[PDB]
Scaffold this motif. Structure first.
Motif, PDB file in Angstrom:
ATOM      1  N   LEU A  30      -1.472   0.687  -9.502  1.00  0.00           N
ATOM      2  CA  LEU A  30      -1.286   1.898  -8.745  1.00  0.00           C
ATOM      3  C   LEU A  30      -2.622   2.376  -8.175  1.00  0.00           C
ATOM      4  CD1 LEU A  30      -0.011   5.340  -9.762  1.00  0.00           C
ATOM      5  CD2 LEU A  30      -0.610   4.375  -7.528  1.00  0.00           C
ATOM      6  N   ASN A  31      -3.668   2.386  -8.997  1.00  0.00           N
ATOM      7  CA  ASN A  31      -4.980   2.830  -8.543  1.00  0.00           C
ATOM      8  C   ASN A  31      -5.574   1.917  -7.481  1.00  0.00           C
ATOM      9  OD1 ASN A  31      -5.924   3.932 -11.847  1.00  0.00           O
ATOM     10  ND2 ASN A  31      -5.012   5.085 -10.143  1.00  0.00           N
ATOM     11  N   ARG A  73      -4.583   1.907   0.231  1.00  0.00           N
ATOM     12  CA  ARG A  73      -3.949   2.826   1.155  1.00  0.00           C
ATOM     13  C   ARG A  73      -4.928   3.817   1.780  1.00  0.00           C
ATOM     14  NH1 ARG A  73      -1.469   3.359   4.881  1.00  0.00           N
ATOM     15  NH2 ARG A  73       0.384   2.404   3.913  1.00  0.00           N
ATOM     16  N   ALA A  74      -5.816   4.396   0.983  1.00  0.00           N
ATOM     17  CA  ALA A  74      -6.746   5.369   1.540  1.00  0.00           C
ATOM     18  C   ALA A  74      -7.693   4.690   2.526  1.00  0.00           C
ATOM     19  CB  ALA A  74      -7.528   6.043   0.432  1.00  0.00           C
ATOM     20  N   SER A  82       0.803  -1.220   0.000  1.00  0.00           N
ATOM     21  CA  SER A  82       0.000   0.000   0.000  1.00  0.00           C
ATOM     22  C   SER A  82       0.835   1.270   0.000  1.00  0.00           C
ATOM     23  CB  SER A  82      -0.924   0.011   1.212  1.00  0.00           C
ATOM     24  OG  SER A  82      -0.176   0.082   2.410  1.00  0.00           O
ATOM     25  N   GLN A  83       2.130   1.123   0.241  1.00  0.00           N
ATOM     26  CA  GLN A  83       3.005   2.283   0.253  1.00  0.00           C
ATOM     27  C   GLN A  83       3.753   2.357  -1.072  1.00  0.00           C
ATOM     28  OE1 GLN A  83       5.065   3.140   4.297  1.00  0.00           O
ATOM     29  NE2 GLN A  83       4.681   0.924   4.447  1.00  0.00           N
ATOM     30  N   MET A  97       4.890   3.043  -4.804  1.00  0.00           N
ATOM     31  CA  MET A  97       4.714   4.165  -5.706  1.00  0.00           C
ATOM     32  C   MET A  97       5.036   3.628  -7.083  1.00  0.00           C
ATOM     33  SD  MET A  97       3.829   6.416  -3.679  1.00  0.00           S
ATOM     34  CE  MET A  97       3.851   8.061  -4.324  1.00  0.00           C
ATOM     35  N   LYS A 102      -1.033   1.352 -14.078  1.00  0.00           N
ATOM     36  CA  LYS A 102      -2.206   2.106 -13.658  1.00  0.00           C
ATOM     37  C   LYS A 102      -3.180   1.302 -12.792  1.00  0.00           C
ATOM     38  CE  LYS A 102      -5.333   5.501 -15.641  1.00  0.00           C
ATOM     39  NZ  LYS A 102      -6.131   5.860 -16.844  1.00  0.00           N
ATOM     40  N   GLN A 129      -3.800   2.772  -4.402  1.00  0.00           N
ATOM     41  CA  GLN A 129      -4.288   4.022  -3.844  1.00  0.00           C
ATOM     42  C   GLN A 129      -5.600   3.871  -3.075  1.00  0.00           C
ATOM     43  OE1 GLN A 129      -1.932   6.987  -6.907  1.00  0.00           O
ATOM     44  NE2 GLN A 129      -4.116   6.565  -7.226  1.00  0.00           N
TER      45      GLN A 129
END
Length: 71
Positions: free
Chosen positions: A57-58, A64-65, A35-36, A38, A54, A61
């Motif tokens: 990554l999405n 993580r949120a 989750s960290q 990049m 993508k 994101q």
């Protein structure tokens, strides 16, 4: 969210299972670290296709949120 006790499951859920081998061998073995991740990390584990970078990554994101809400 976490219908996956594991990173391989998650990669599988988002149809990115082809990378489990790559992720594991790079130390991204829990959601905590994943989750960290990049873009740089995604490239390093070797994800080279734009669409995959993508999608992944999405997902990360959202992961993580969400983790951040349940601090």
């Amino acid at each position: 969210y976490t219908s996956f006790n594991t990173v391989d499951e998650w990669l599988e859920a988002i149809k990115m299972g082809q990378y489990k081998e790559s992720f594991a061998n790079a130390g991204f073995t829990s959601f905590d670290v994943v989750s960290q991740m990049m873009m740089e990390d995604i490239l390093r584990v070797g994800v080279t296709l734009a669409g995959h970078q993508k999608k992944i990554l999405n997902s990360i994101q959202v992961m993580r949120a969400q983790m951040n809400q349940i601090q």
